[PDB]
Design a protein around this ligand. Structure first.
Ligand SMILES: CC(C)[C@H](Nc1ncnc2[nH]c(-c3cnn(C)c3)cc12)c1ccc2c(c1)S(=O)(=O)NCC2
Length: 168
């Protein structure tokens, strides 16, 4: 169960690996995989699109049905849906998109959602096309998450900069 391999332990509860979150989810089948979602759960590209494609679009169909019944999420919020073939559950978390004018302070609220689950496989919230400084996103994760989080970062250059930044 939760057989994470090759991670570097940064703190008592935060681990990090240079890896594709989709490939990690297939190998580990964690209890929870985090999706870096938007408020309408439209998994159009990036991490969210890759996780959806690995479920052969079942995650998008389920997400559309969720939004029809419940309405959109809030920035900083989350919902629990099926993990399909990737995990027992998928925790869809909306980090702020600072390239769209959303407040970076909401990144603390976004990582707070992780605390309702004992173990999670997750990406670096608000990084990539969401525009946040990835070194800042790792600092907010370390300061906010109290449960056990395994971060998969699919870029060796960024992985090295994050580990060097943490060990300063
Ligand atoms: C900073 C990046 C290195 C990181 N990327 C990733 N981190 C971890 N597992 C990944 N799998 C893939 C993948 C697998 N297949 N395809 C076609 C893509 C990307 C990827 C990342 C972190 C957070 C965010 C993004 C990207 S995003 O721009 O897609 N959306 C905003 C949030």
């Amino acid at each position: 169960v939760n057989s994470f391999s090759g991670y570097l332990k940064l703190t008592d509860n935060v681990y990090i690996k240079n890896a594709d979150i989709v490939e990690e989810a297939k190998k580990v089948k964690p209890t929870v995989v985090v999706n870096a979602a938007n408020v309408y759960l439209k998994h159009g590209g990036g991490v969210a699109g890759a996780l959806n494609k690995a479920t052969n679009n079942a995650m998008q169909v389920e997400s559309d049905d969720y939004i029809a019944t419940n309405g959109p999420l809030k920035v900083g919020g989350s919902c629990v849906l099926s993990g399909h073939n990737l995990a027992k559950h998928c925790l869809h978390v909306v980090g702020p998109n600072v390239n769209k004018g959303e407040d970076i302070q909401l990144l603390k609220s976004a990582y707070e959602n992780f605390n309702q689950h004992e173990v999670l496989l997750a990406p670096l919230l608000s990084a990539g096309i969401f525009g946040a400084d990835p070194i800042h996103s790792l600092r907010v994760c370390v300061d906010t998450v109290r449960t056990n989080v395994y971060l998969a970062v699919f870029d060796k250059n960024l992985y090295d900069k994050l580990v060097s930044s943490f060990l300063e």
